[PDB]
Amino acid sequence: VLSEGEWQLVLHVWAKVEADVAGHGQDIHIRLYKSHPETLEKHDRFKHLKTEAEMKASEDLKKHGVTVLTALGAILKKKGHHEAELKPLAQAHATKHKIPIKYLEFISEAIIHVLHSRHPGDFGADAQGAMNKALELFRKDIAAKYKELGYQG
């Protein structure tokens, strides 16, 4: 469980994300695919994007990153009370897309990296720790929902 202080730090940096959701989402996806190339194979519509500039230029990828961060931000704002928001997400990623928990660790690393790169004055040690705890809780709870659906990834 996170303390109220830790949730406030999470939501404080998230308000910064919200000034440019698209760009944060592009940088996160580009970092993810570059750091952990096995992840990009899950997206057939993104495979022809070979360079960073091609990735940034893709409206499809840009919209997808907003879809992703919108869902995540709605989850974070519930401060752990997120079952109703996690179920549809788990259902899609366990039954349709088949995304192992390890890939959710990889995108968590990419989120932390990009938040630090863009907002270092608002993402110091305690804020990084708070966001780490929140993403860990997200991953723990989505893993339990995965197993309820019969997926052990």
Task: Quote the CA–CA distance of 52 and 86 in Å, as a whole number.
Answer: 30
- Asked if 107 is part of the footprint of ligand HEM (rule: CB under 6 A), the reply reads yes
> CB-wise, 43 or 119, nearer to ligand HEM?
43
Phi-psi region of 120 (alpha: psi -120 to 50; beta: other; left: phi over 0): alpha
Nearest approach, Cβ of residue 51 and ligand HEM (Å): 19
> CB-wise, 21 or 71, nearer to ligand HEM?
71
Q: How many residues does the chain have?
A: 153
Q: Which of residues 39-98 bind ligand HEM (CB under 6 A)?
A: 39, 42-43, 45, 67-68, 71-72, 89, 92-93, 97
Nearest approach, Cβ of residue 124 and ligand HEM (Å): 22
3-state secondary structure 68-107: HHHHHHHHHHCCCCCHHHHHHHHHHHHHHCCCCHHHHHHH
| Size of site (CB under 6 A) for ligand HEM | 16
State the amino acid at position 21 in one-letter form: V
Residue 24 marked ligand-binding = no
Task: Quote the CA–CA distance of 62 and 66 in Å, as a whole number.
Answer: 7
Residue 36 marked ligand-binding = no
> CB-wise, 107 or 127, nearer to ligand HEM?
107
Q: Site residues (CB under 6 A) for ligand HEM?
A: 39, 42-43, 45, 67-68, 71-72, 89, 92-93, 97, 99, 103-104, 107
Residues annotated in a binding site:
64, 93
